[PDB]
Symmetry: D4
Amino acid sequence: QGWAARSWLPAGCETAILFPMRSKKIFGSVHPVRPMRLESFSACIWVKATDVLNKTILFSYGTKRNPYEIQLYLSYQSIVFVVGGEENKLVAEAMVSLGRWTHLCGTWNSEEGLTSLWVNGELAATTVEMATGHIVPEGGILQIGQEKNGCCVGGGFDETLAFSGRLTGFNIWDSVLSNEEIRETGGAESCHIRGNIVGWGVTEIQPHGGAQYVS
Amino acid sequence: QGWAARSWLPAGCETAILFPMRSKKIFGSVHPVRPMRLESFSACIWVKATDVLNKTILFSYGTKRNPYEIQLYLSYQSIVFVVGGEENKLVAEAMVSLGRWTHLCGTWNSEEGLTSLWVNGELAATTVEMATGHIVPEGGILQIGQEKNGCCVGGGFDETLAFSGRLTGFNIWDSVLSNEEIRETGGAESCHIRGNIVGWGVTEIQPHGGAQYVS
Amino acid sequence: QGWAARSWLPAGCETAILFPMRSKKIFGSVHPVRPMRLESFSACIWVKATDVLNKTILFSYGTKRNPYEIQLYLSYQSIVFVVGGEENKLVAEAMVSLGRWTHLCGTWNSEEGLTSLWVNGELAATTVEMATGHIVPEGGILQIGQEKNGCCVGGGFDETLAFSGRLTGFNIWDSVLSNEEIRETGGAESCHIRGNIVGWGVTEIQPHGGAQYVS
Amino acid sequence: QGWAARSWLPAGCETAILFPMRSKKIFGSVHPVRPMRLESFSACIWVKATDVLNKTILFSYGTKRNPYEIQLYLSYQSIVFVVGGEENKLVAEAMVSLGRWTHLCGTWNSEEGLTSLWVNGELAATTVEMATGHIVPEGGILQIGQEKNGCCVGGGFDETLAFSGRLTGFNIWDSVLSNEEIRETGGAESCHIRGNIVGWGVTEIQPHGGAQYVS
Amino acid sequence: QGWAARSWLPAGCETAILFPMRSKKIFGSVHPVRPMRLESFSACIWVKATDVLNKTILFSYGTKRNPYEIQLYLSYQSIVFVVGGEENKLVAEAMVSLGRWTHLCGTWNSEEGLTSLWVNGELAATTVEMATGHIVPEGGILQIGQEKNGCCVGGGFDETLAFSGRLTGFNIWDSVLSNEEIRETGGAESCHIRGNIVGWGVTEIQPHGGAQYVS
Amino acid sequence: QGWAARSWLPAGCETAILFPMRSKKIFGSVHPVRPMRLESFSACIWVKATDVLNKTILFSYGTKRNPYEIQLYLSYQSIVFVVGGEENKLVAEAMVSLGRWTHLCGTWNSEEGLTSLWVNGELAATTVEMATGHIVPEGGILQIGQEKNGCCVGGGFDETLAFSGRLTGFNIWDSVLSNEEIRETGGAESCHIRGNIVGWGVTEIQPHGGAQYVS
Amino acid sequence: QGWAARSWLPAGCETAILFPMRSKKIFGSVHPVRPMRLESFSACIWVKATDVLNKTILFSYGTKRNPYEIQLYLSYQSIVFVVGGEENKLVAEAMVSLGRWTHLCGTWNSEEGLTSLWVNGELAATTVEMATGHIVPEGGILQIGQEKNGCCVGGGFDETLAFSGRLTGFNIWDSVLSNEEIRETGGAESCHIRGNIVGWGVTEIQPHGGAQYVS
Amino acid sequence: QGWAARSWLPAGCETAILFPMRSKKIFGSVHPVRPMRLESFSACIWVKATDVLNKTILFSYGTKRNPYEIQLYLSYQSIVFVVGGEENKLVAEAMVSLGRWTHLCGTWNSEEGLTSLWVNGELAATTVEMATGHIVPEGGILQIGQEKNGCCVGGGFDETLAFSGRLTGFNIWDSVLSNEEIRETGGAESCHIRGNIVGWGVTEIQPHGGAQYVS
Ligand SMILES: *[C@@H]1O[C@H](CO)[C@@H](O)[C@H](O)[C@H]1NC(C)=O
Ligand SMILES: *[C@@H]1O[C@H](CO)[C@@H](O)[C@H](O)[C@H]1NC(C)=O
Ligand SMILES: *[C@@H]1O[C@H](CO)[C@@H](O)[C@H](O)[C@H]1NC(C)=O
Ligand SMILES: *[C@@H]1O[C@H](CO)[C@@H](O)[C@H](O)[C@H]1NC(C)=O
Ligand SMILES: *[C@@H]1O[C@H](CO)[C@@H](O)[C@H](O)[C@H]1NC(C)=O
Ligand SMILES: *[C@@H]1O[C@H](CO)[C@@H](O)[C@H](O)[C@H]1NC(C)=O
Ligand SMILES: *[C@@H]1O[C@H](CO)[C@@H](O)[C@H](O)[C@H]1NC(C)=O
Ligand SMILES: *[C@@H]1O[C@H](CO)[C@@H](O)[C@H](O)[C@H]1NC(C)=O
């Protein structure tokens, strides 16, 4: 039991990415096939955080002129969803427990800045007028476990921002999932339902700097 | 059980190749010791497809002058077996299911263009006069999960053609297997039955571009 | 059962580092974020030694001018804790059995040179006036399984000093842990307890020379 | 039990080396710290052969002047032990079954050329006057799964000689083990018994060319 | 004077590619940024051939379905220009001398199949109705010194086809250059004249397999 | 003469960086020891441009928040100097010529936004009130021949922005050089004059993506 | 003058291989396309030895059974030519001077064991009945600057045997060259004369372990 | 003359090592085959320093217990020769010119601690009773251009200690050279006279971290 418990993966998922540590060079890169130009999206992930600091990035999308087009990050017990800029922040106060698998979904629509944050399929936080009329542009860099800064040596990333733990089932839909669907994506057998922008198991994800597929 | 099931391999096989994603660079290369000059053959494989598009390659043999000497590939619900050229398709209409280990095996003979396609040991489709009198040349490149295209350059493959999922038990015989032998190669303990042209566990197979042995 | 036994990891821990052999090049490097300047410390680790010689290093800290600022090493059945110099040696006489996961943790305070060794939560040895008033300097190199000698080129480490076996849960605190906390760090569910100088799963640890994360 | 049988390792052994295929470049290199100068020796290994040809090398010791100072190899159902030269050959006739873990020991003494083969702890063959008065020289290259000639010329080994399958517990003693000890090295809990020239888990073994530790 | 001669480069160019040998893996890859779709073109190069066989490739463009969309190759003293297929040759006679820098430039127009071959600025051969109405397709692979073949397998190319010697000033224009311009591109200080499809010093060229920039 | 001329380097300098082409991955990285926090600066370089587009970067400093803290780039015959943002631009109209070693210096002072641009030691453009009171921040990435966008990710730079040609003598001073000193940095024997922020031959510069030291 | 002299190459040769040192891992590998089965041969090379020990290898051919099928090596001022075995040896007594380009060429014919050794085009030694009726086998490994031994990770070659200095113009003919031709291969422009078994500039030669092409 | 002057190397030497910059990772490693146990020695080098700080290492020998067994390093105007420990300095005050080739020899004898420092063949400084009766130990690490730390570490060395510029003719004799011999080693054609412990061109020297052979 002790092995099967620690080797357990949440949905029917068969692969995860391990972050054995935080460091200045560990990150995952995500390579969507179709462009990340979005007027609304849902972004869901399974996270098993080892340790949480002031700001541990789960995933981050950013362009050249705006590093913070989308972020999902943990702040101790809290979860922080960011769209369009650091000032555009939705906080779920107390939701993440270390060392156990928890499912997160962000959800945002430009047309009313309508934003929503879900934990294990329950509405954790909601807000309106967040980045109203903003459009997430194409051509940015999407990462997991780290924020845009630089993989290209000379210092690397900010080690204090890095994720440590395990991730699986990273999915982005170019659209707001209905509440019913959001509960489905967290379901016991849900790993096969995957996003149309980023689909876990189809979209190229490269671990770097000591991140590993745990297959 | 779920942790045992998520790691189960179909026959007694004890290695598979994981394709964690489709990508411009992911493929397996296969290096037969004896030449791929064939007047008849049987080609069997275990596949566990993650996701299927319009054409996802399971394996492909091609020469410099003809990229499509042999192909087995999946369409959204269908298995397509190609010999001698893209125009020579045998299509089995409706019997590949995602996330389930299924055994496929194709059989062809030049002498009457007699071709046959088998799924989990059942005859799925058959045809005659397919590539009649054609001989598969030697000196081609055999790949799994991707079709012959640009390989040494950055990227170079068509990302939409790539396999994603798991493969095991890829076998090629320089002969038409009898119907009883075809049912054997799918059997519960069949992994030790291996091809004389390509034998799983014997023929050198190199995963590239993020494909992994899952040993 | 035996298969689940050979993969069992001691506390709730889910990653370990395997040393498949001793050699002139195998070691782990440890990269603390905050400086290793210490006036007292606690250093705990889980070890499953394959084979023990006159001196098998579990971990070693040192600088240019003093290679032996801290060492924990095994000497056949004995455990040896070193602080400030090779002359400053605390020996627990008969405490390591091969092939069994055992928890070791050392504690030292400069203010009285007070020093203790703990094995599976029981006080194994203690001494006073060991390196009294010494301060462990910063900017040194911390290693697991090997002592300062190699890196770079030439197969520089002493192969006879190298660890072989498995390690997990390497932790360093910048303080003397109370006896009750020391018994906690060996507990069945303790892996979430991690040090503020080195934390297992948080501090960057790089295996080299054939050392592997097993995870 | 599907996964447990596949992942079972014979003695208490907690690592093996997988040869996923035969090829011109796959081999293991073994690096004894003390010299391979031998007037007698015992050499034991666990093998799980995938496929056996005319000659599949399990391990081979040779020098520049003589590639065949020691060989253990399989020849279909037969096991062949070589000392001092290809002419000096002891054959056990029908002793190796594919896909099953089996334990082999060779034993040789120069003083009478007395030689024995053991399979699963039973004496399988014996002979006398084999390489009488010969001394195995030091300074040779010891390999597992492949024979000396080749390497670095793009592999350059004879693909037909290569092992495929799994190996564990490779051990060499600089002495004739007694019959009682030989039965112990095959025991259910014997993996802690290791040789003084080559010890499994102690002597550096490097897999090359697609050979892998399975850990 | 001896050293000045050995290092001399023909036009004002200050960069060449050396092919120190022919082999199964030496080639240059060329990466035009705008597509190689051509209804007419001019292709000029400086060659210093070390040794010429029956077919030594200077450059080759081909697609998956047609390896021979464009080739320029030497055949002993003869020079052979290919467009649209092997069957479509323009052969100049007795024109390349080994070890001497010579400028070659091909020219072709689909509209009348008008084709022309130039050596050191003099018309060497001309023909008409060659690949009339053919359009060179985009999306192929352009190489220097070697022909489209396998490249990501070990070796893979036909060693007898490979160039050996030095190359510089490889240029392609999406148009027929006038005779005046063709004489200019061979000029003593012409090297700054570069093509709009491939420009020397501008288009990415990667030497592989022991080819070197000697700049 | 031509052999000596093609290898000539401008001042006494005895190394340069060659950009053989303008690919998506070619760039130089520059690693100042002391911080790039600047209230005034002088930046000088020797350039021998092969080919110039709308915008060919000579060097670029930028942070995560602002990619354009400092840029010097060529636009056909024009030189463009940027400080604090793309809107803050000083253009020298018509004085870079392809294939000729030319020396450039930009100087800027925050305290009046006083900015000046120099070509071969002659004042070429000047402006007041450019980025007045702005301070260039620390912690950015300094590059030569390319603009911050992103290595990894398969290259990820804009190919049209990349420099091609040769560079030497890149120097940055944390002060406005006097007009006399600017003429000195251009002098025929000036290579020993180097900056206190970036000094040619002391600051670490790494060529990437096919950029080469020519030594 | 000295700048030209230090870079001068002997014949018209436009490429050399530098051995900067005599380490345990430096060697050149030579890959003839047609087999090294020889009943007679001629083997010529240019050498500029830095330092000579009792045995410095210029080139060596051997098989697993016999490392010494052909060797040319220097022994202080002496030159030693070996065919078929170390016992079969032709010694030119006092003929190699350090730091000077000197042409050596050996010549052997099995039919009478007729053997000849030439220095700068002059007959230096001759003998008969050397390896009479021996045939040099195919399938051996040909090296320059080092003798057949361990490559791999095997600790490498014998450092004392290694060449240091420069080599060019290594050529092997499958025949005895006439005396007139032997004087030609040393001539002022002779670098274009190359062997039919090994030809300098056409046969693949790979420098390893710090050996460099000087081009 | 412009190129010939900057390409000139001091003695007959025809290779040097370039340090294009100081950095945390640039160094040379030196691998004497016979032990560095010394009771007296002479150590000579050609240096062309680009830039000199408080302490720029030319070469350094150190053990595990003592980093400073031997050092030769420059200071802003001065050469400092260290034997046995940092406290044992022989300082020559005012005689390295930046950018000009100069020949340095250190000379030390344990018996009277007699030490001598020579610049361009003239006695620069002398002292007695320096490290009297000390013996330089076996088994240390000898470096050029940097002081003993670990590398790895993503760097590790103090960047402010690193050499930048060019080095050639690094020679160590296990003896005090006579004054006559010391004037020889600096001679116009002295490159061929080389040390018996370290000989330039025979002892393996590996450049690391962007140090380059210039050949
Ligand atoms: C956590 O993050 C916020 C940024 O939103 C920062 O203001 C604060 O300093 C952090 N908390 C602590 C305790 O440092
Ligand atoms: C599926 O593939 C066929 C080729 O047989 C193609 O004609 C068709 O367009 C594809 N379907 C879709 C929906 O793209
Ligand atoms: C074990 O180590 C000690 C050093 O503390 C040494 O004196 C001794 O030789 C060693 N014992 C053996 C049996 O080698
Ligand atoms: C098996 O090996 C022997 C060498 O001992 C050889 O004579 C024989 O040809 C081989 N057998 C077959 C069937 O090839
Ligand atoms: C060269 O190739 C041509 C084919 O174009 C062939 O006809 C000819 O015989 C070949 N010659 C040789 C010597 O191989
Ligand atoms: C060159 O750059 C400028 C930006 O200042 C832009 O306005 C213009 O479109 C460009 N010129 C061309 C011909 O594209
Ligand atoms: C050199 O080699 C020969 C063997 O050919 C040997 O007889 C002799 O001892 C050696 N000489 C020296 C000085 O080592
Ligand atoms: C240079 O080095 C010496 C060490 O002998 C030291 O005393 C001094 O502080 C240094 N000089 C400067 C200007 O830092």
